[PDB]
């Protein structure tokens, strides 16, 4: 019936519009179609009649129309620096002959008709950059094609009389370069990709800190004046390119004018466009200057960007408009029986010549004619006689001027291979009208891709190796994009001598980031989401021949008709074409420059190095009147400065007072070069923040909405969170308070309404026909709206017991609730709908929100995991979000108050609203795509995950498909949420098209520093004043600033914010917290909020992160890595993450016995027992240094104890290897006194276990993935001699060495190969032959220990594998970098903070150390004491039970102490929590003799 009436008012709406050829009537089209085609394959009421059906179709043919719009009069074309000007004004020419009433706008940056030398500069840098990065990481093997890079480099010395043999050089130094082995070649791609974006990223840190709105040629000049050495003969070579490419454009825009007139063709300059200087598209126009490898060809976001702008026809400037029907008809009468001529590529390019020469008035036999036979030259000399001999102005014929609304037709080409046809869509030819759809897709698209491809760097924790098995379709993958960007850099230009078939790198045009491909699969996308009228588009999943233009005939029964084609295209077959760009026509040369790299300035570019600031070099510019002024501030800031960016965890309140004050140091000081230092420790600073993550707690929950029809997409998602992993912790939330005021809501709005089931359905649609046919219509909705909410208004102002109490019983209480509703309605009679059909309703709404909680408890009663809580009960009395239960909160966005409060509330992980799915694995993936198509797995993963949770098996798919996917373990298919990381500044967000939102929410882990949940609960709390000021009536300026006096939640105080929020009050005083918080601040969510809150205590990273997201960058609070897919179209939530092709790699899990043995209290006796033995067996092998420091954290074998592993993998120096050995020892001494002893710890100290645990369990996962994948790291089977080889001569630094149950490392520490094992600890040898001997060994020490090991009764060579990688950085990428300070800071615990400061307290009358007191054990509020209290803070001090119990069970407490603690007991009480203890603290043991002489020899000393 919804469908129905929908129907009707679609159609009751259309036929009344001002035009019907627009937007909103294709909208509504398409929506009617779509719904009726639901409707005619919806057997609702049986299959009806055939002739329903019949019905149906020819309806649906019918309503489709044309909509056709006409195209601007407009001819595009965009001018490429070098360009010469003599072969473009042929076709110029040509093209305005041919079209008549068109105009022809040549479009010139004359702001970078350098960039190609700042290009070729940056460049040449970075691929320095990368060579000494790669012989740094090889230094065993001397690679000798640097050798020869570098030798030419330096062998270059002239310039005028050099360039071309340096070039030549290289050309030739490219085969050297085609002889490496292929993971030195995936490392030089990948390391000159990252280089070429890292310096990117450098140019537009000096635009920002320069605070330049446009980017010209100066400002790159000055730009590499500040980086490189740049001389003045450089920058006279740069102008004298700018000034020649000026000429040349003036040149030949003068000629076409004089000979056209100057309004026919006239020149555009591309920075008029509104385009460039958008943020969402984040100067993607510069990148795409610099990621480049089509020199030649013009830029591929101009030509949408001018479309979009200006629309009309774009066209290249190498192409000639299609030959008439006469033209074709006298070629094949010269021709009789030969179709070569109009098919082979060379004939026709020559015939091509021979009419654009006759066209132009030139000497028309002066033709090439190259390597054709004499036969073909003189057929080709006849014919182009017969066709001069015919008039001009009907040569060539013009393209269709009409076209669908919001489309873009492709030109089609046709190629005749040596193995066939090649028919594939080109950029280079386009039609559109101004601000189109379609053109913002394929922009948008275009934004994606190139975030997609800006992922080497934004994504630390990236893929470096991926073994290149399989790439096919759209393939993004950045190792091919880096190999061909070394191939253009290296080897010249591309097209060199042959390429491929017919001069034709199709793989290059697979390859391009926004080339045809982009396009034509965009707008196939966009085709498919128009609805059923976009399938007359799509023909099996490939664009039709109506989408493109040219198209000719496929059936002439043999090759092609070539008289009438569909439509009308071009001539893109032309002399000037890439088949003489390469080799005929001279190579452009003057786009190179020559700059030696010897004399980069490091300092400048903290994005590449980390530079540490010193007294000595970091002023050595600075001018005298700001040195001896700030210098001595930079001087004692060095100290901390340091400290900061050499750490492994953040210290937010060194970090804000540093930042603070650097911005203050910005603020009052006036220099250029002072400032451009400071800036780059500003920029050290952001990086440092973006480098560091923290994992997340391995917790779903999910908010889910209990009015939604359909049930079985919250029960996928938790069984599929349920599958994914073992240890998954699912939440479901709800809060009975809601939904009873969501119904009291209903309740109220329909009385409102009343101021104002076949039988039932049949009356409602007659009344709301006989409404829709008369006056009613069109003047009341809007009023029916209005008059709910305000009387919504007026029902909360009341405030009677209806309002403060809600009703929450509703068993007997209902009959005032009723007089009540009788007193607001304006029937004035009884039982209207109100003592009848009212109780029903509300019985209605109470079975189904509890039928809906006991379904959802009932089918996970068996899962402990699966916990369902009320948010009621979990959140404080009197909090922000209670009071906004208790008053009688509604909107939308309670839940995202909810997800907030909850979390400052203590739970962690991910938080969402929607039912997420894990993410589908890359063994999914792959067995997906033995079969389909890359574009059809987005399709067909539901079904897959249908069969993998559900065990439905479908008919869509092969059975070979359904027995793989039964094969492998659920938890294998599905990526779970261990092992995610997120930003230090804690909650995370998801993102679409770059934008965050707040569908995801990605909070850190517990007991890591939260600053974001602090801001915000302080924000909500004053959004919160905010509505109850906008309740009242009662608010101006004065109030609304004191209110917002003492808040972070002031920088958002300005005038017009001021007069935005009185008016909105003004307007309608009852407002959502979301929407004041768009009011006042303008940002549309709470999640673009929390930056700026940030930049209160971050005045200068907070602004540099801010303004670095509309250059290309992430926001510091998105995702990168999404885990977590939605259900109805299966796509990554993450910033720049497509799980399609970027899946992650499955995590291989270890299992135990459920009987394993060693619990908490029976641990120790493993190490009691073979301890001794572990270090007589070292010192047998020799060992100079053996130390141990066994752990008691992971009592069990599960993760084969891999994450302590990987920690000592962390280290790797002496220093940190102890630091993270002592942090360690500190805290499997809090766990055993936590958790075995059941004694609670102060607040640092459990955070700090918290920490460690979080960190341990991240690791863990992360190592058993790194373990079962080959391409990240090289497994091998047990061997002495292939090991001490591989430490020896090809030169590893760090290796495990895992057996089935536990894990072990070696290092190189320093020249002594130190061996770690968790449990005993660590032992150095001087070569690596007897380390591997010890191992060995030290598996078969104990038949206990061998079996706890999983190697009894099993061969030792077969089950022991050895891990390691190809170079160190690829360990730096794997292993995070905050490890909350384990392996750089020593953590104290709280005792050693209290024993450090020496003051002692005034309690109960006597005196007594911090340290002792605590040692007793204080509780404040149950919760240990860790300050010294004040006096108001004694007589609130309890004594807690336990702690002292065991206190006296470990010391023996002296007399002069004991009559303390008894006056301590006596004076306070005991807490309820713990137990009482007898006072027995009494000291007589043995004999004060052996104090006597201790006392006598300190005295003596």
């Known amino acids: ?639 901390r400065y340091n400290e900061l960016i050499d750490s492994s965890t953040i210290d937010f309140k060194n970090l804000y007072e540093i930042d603070q004050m650097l911005h203050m140091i910005m603020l009052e000081m006036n220099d250029d070069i002072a400032k451009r230092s400071l800036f780059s420790l500003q920029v050290q600073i952001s990086e440092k923040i973006r480098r560091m993550t923290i994992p997340v707690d391995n917790i779903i929950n999910i908010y889910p909405d209990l009015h939604k029809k359909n049930d079985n997409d919250l029960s996928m998602s938790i069984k599929g969170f349920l599958a994914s992993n073992p240890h998954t912790k699912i939440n479901i939330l709800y809060s009975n308070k809601t939904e009873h005021n969501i119904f009291i809501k209903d309740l109220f709005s329909f009385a409102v309404m009343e101021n104002e089931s076949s039988q039932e359905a049949n009356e409602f649609l007659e009344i709301s026909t006989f409404i829709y046919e008369n006056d009613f219509l069109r003047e009341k909705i809007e009023a029916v709206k209005n008059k709910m909410n305000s009387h919504e208004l007026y029902f909360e102002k009341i405030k009677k017991e209806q309002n403060t109490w809600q009703d929450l019983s509703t068993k007997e209480q209902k009959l005032q609730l009723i007089k ?216 101006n300026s004065q109030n609304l600033r004191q209110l917002l006096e003492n808040s972070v939640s002031s920088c958002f105080l300005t005038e017009q914010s001021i007069n935005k929020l009185l008016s909105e009050a003004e307007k309608r005083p009852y407002q959502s917290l979301t929407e004041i918080h768009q009011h006042l601040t303008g940002l549309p969510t709470i999640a673009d909020a929390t930056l700026s809150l940030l930049s209160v205590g971050l005045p200068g990273t907070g602004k540099l992160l801010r303004r670095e997201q509309d250059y290309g960058r992430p926001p510091v609070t998105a995702i990168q890595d999404s885990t977590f897919v939605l259900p109805y179209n299966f796509k990554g939530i993450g910033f720049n993450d497509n799980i399609i092709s970027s899946a992650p790699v499955a995590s291989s899990l270890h299992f135990i016995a459920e009987h394993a043995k060693y619990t908490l209290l029976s641990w120790p006796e493993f190490y009691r027992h073979h301890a001794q033995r572990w270090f007589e067996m070292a010192k047998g092998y020799g060992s100079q240094n053996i130390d141990f420091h066994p752990q008691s954290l992971l009592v069990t074998q599960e993760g084969r104890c891999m994450g302590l592993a990987l920690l000592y993998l962390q280290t790797e120096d002496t220093a940190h290897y102890s630091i993270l050995q002592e942090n360690l020892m500190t805290v499997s001494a809090l766990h055993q006194t936590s958790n075995r002893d059941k004694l609670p710890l102060s607040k640092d100290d459990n955070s700090l276990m918290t920490r460690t645990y979080s960190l341990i369990e991240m690791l863990q996962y992360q190592g058993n993935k790194y373990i079962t994948n080959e391409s990240l790291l090289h497994k091998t089977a047990w061997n002495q001699e292939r090991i001490t080889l591989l430490f020896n001569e090809k030169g590893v630094k760090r290796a495990l060495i895992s057996t089935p149950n536990h894990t072990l490392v070696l290092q190189q520490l320093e020249d002594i190969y130190r061996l770690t094992d968790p449990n005993f600890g660590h032992a150095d040898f001087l070569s690596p032959i007897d380390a591997l001997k010890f191992i060995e060994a030290m598996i078969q020490l104990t038949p206990t220990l061998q079996e706890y090991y999983g190697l009894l009764n099993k061969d030792i060579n077969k089950h022991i594998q050895v891990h390691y990688a190809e170079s160190d950085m690829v360990w730096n990428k794997l292993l995070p970098e905050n490890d909350a300070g384990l392996s750089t800071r020593i953590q104290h615990t709280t005792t050693d903070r209290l024993a450090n400061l020496a003051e002692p307290v005034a309690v109960a009358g006597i005196s007594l150390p911090v340290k002792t007191l605590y040692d007793i054990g204080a509780t404040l509020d149950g919760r240990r004491i860790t300050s010294p209290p004040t006096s108001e803070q004694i007589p609130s001090l309890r004594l807690n039970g336990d702690v002292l119990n065991d206190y006296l069970s470990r010391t023996v407490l002296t007399p002069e102490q004991a009559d303390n603690i008894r006056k301590i007991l006596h004076t306070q009480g005991i807490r309820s929590g713990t137990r009482p203890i007898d006072p027995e603290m009494i000291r007589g043991t043995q004999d004060d003799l052996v104090s006597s002489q201790t006392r006598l020899q300190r005295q003596a000393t």
């Not at 000034?243 to 020149?267: A, M, P, T, W």
């Not at 304006?826 to 109470?846: I, M, P, Q, V, W």
């Not at 659920?970 to 990381?981: A, I, K």
């Open 1 to 639: 019936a919804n469908e129905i009436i929908e129907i009707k008012r679609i159609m009751g709406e259309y036929n009344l519009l001002p035009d019907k050829n627009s937007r909103n009537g294709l909208k509504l089209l398409q929506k009617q179609a779509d719904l009726l085609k639901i409707i005619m394959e919806d057997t609702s009421v049986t299959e009806n009649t055939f002739k329903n059906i019949e019905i149906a179709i020819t309806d649906i043919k019918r309503e489709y129309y044309s909509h056709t719009v006409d195209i601007e009069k407009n001819i595009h074309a965009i001018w490429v620096a070098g360009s010469p000007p003599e072969s473009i004004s042929d076709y110029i020419k040509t093209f305005l002959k041919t079209y008549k009433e068109f105009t022809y706008y040549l479009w010139v940056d004359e702001k970078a008709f350098g960039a190609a030398k700042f290009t070729s500069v940056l460049k040449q840098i970075a691929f320095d950059l990368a060579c000494r990065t790669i012989q740094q990481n090889t230094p065993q093997k001397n690679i000798d094609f640097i050798n020869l890079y570098n030798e030419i480099r330096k062998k270059y010395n002239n310039n005028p009389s050099g360039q071309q043999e340096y070039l030549n050089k290289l050309r030739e130094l490219y085969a050297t370069y085609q002889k490496i082995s292929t993971p030195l070649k995936h490392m030089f791609n990948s390391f000159f990709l990252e280089n070429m974006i890292k310096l990117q990223d450098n140019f537009f840190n000096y635009c920002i800190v320069k605070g330049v709105t446009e980017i010209n040629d100066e400002l790159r000049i000055n730009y590499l004046k500040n980086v490189i050495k740049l001389s003045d003969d450089d920058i006279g070579n740069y102008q004298k390119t700018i000034n020649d490419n000026k000429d040349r454009v003036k040149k030949l825009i003068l000629d076409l004018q004089k000979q056209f007139g100057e309004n026919r063709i006239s020149i555009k300059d591309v920075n008029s466009l509104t385009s460039l200087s958008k943020s969402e598209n984040n100067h993607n126009y510069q990148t795409e200057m610099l990621l480049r490898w089509n020199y030649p060809a013009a830029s591929d976001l101009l030509r949408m960007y001018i479309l979009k702008e200006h629309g009309g026809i774009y066209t290249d400037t190498d192409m000639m408009p299609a030959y008439s029907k006469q033209v074709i008809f006298k070629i094949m009468m010269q021709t009789n029986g030969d179709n070569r001529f109009l098919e082979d590529l060379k004939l026709r390019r020559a015939i091509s010549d021979g009419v654009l020469r006759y066209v132009n008035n030139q000497n028309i036999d002066e033709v090439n004619y190259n390597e054709i036979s004499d036969a073909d030259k003189n057929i080709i000399k006849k014919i182009l006689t017969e066709i001069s001999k015919m008039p001009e102005d009907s040569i060539f014929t013009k393209i269709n001027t009409r076209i669908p609304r919001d489309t873009m037709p492709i030109l089609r080409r046709y190629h005749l291979w040596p193995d066939g046809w090649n028919i594939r869509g080109l950029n280079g030819f386009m039609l559109s009208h101004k601000g189109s759809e379609v053109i913002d897709a394929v922009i948008a698209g275009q934004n994606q891709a190139y975030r997609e491809l800006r992922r080497i760097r934004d994504n630390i924790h990236s893929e470096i190796y991926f073994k290149q098995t399989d790439e096919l379709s759209s393939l993004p993958d950045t190792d091919k994009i880096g190999g061909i960007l070394v191939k253009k850099y290296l080897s010249g230009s591309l097209f060199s001598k042959f390429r491929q078939d017919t001069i034709i790198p199709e793989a290059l045009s697979t390859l391009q980031i926004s080339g045809p491909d982009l396009i034509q699969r965009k707008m196939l996308q966009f085709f498919r989401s128009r609805g059923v009228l976009g399938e007359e588009f799509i023909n099996e999943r490939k664009l039709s021949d109506k989408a493109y233009i040219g198209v000719y005939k496929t059936t002439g029964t043999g090759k092609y008709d070539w008289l009438t084609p569909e439509s009308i295209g071009v001539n893109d077959v032309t002399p000037a074409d890439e088949s003489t760009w390469c080799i005929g026509k001279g190579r452009c040369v003057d786009d190179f420059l020559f700059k030696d790299v010897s004399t980069l300035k490091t300092e400048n570019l903290p994005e590449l190095f980390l530079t540490k600031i010193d007294t000595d070099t970091f002023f050595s510019q600075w001018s005298t009147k700001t040195k001896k002024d700030l210098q001595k501030k930079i001087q004692d800031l060095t100290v």
């Open 820 to 1035: 009540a509703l009788k007193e607001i309605s304006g029937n004035t009679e009884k039982d209207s709908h109100y003592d009848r059909l009212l109780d029903a309703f509300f019985k209605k709404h109470n079975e189904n929100i509890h039928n809906k909680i006991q379904r959802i408890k009932d089918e996970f009663k068996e899962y402990s995991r699966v916990a369902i809580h009320n948010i009621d009960k979990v959140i404080f009395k009197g909090q922000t979000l209670d009071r906004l239960y208790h008053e009688g909160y509604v909107f939308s966005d309670i839940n995202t108050l909810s997800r907030y409060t909850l979390h400052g509330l203590g739970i962690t992980g991910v938080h969402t609203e929607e039912n997420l799915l894990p993410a589908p694995s890359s063994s999914l993936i792959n067995i997906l795509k033995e079969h389909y198509n890359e574009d059809e797995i987005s399709a067909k993963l539901p079904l897959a995950y249908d069969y993998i949770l559900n065990k439905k098996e479908s008919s869509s798919i092969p059975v070979e498909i359904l027995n793989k996917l039964s094969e492998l373990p659920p938890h294998e298919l599905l990526t779970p949420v261990l092992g995610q990381s997120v930003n230090p500044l804690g909650m995370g967000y998801s993102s679409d098209n770059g934008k965050i939102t707040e569908q995801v929410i990605v909070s850190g882990a517990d007991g890591f520093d939260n600053p974001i949940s602090g801001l915000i609960y302080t924000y909500l709390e004053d959004l919160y004043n905010i509505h109850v000021r906008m309740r009242e009536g009662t608010l």
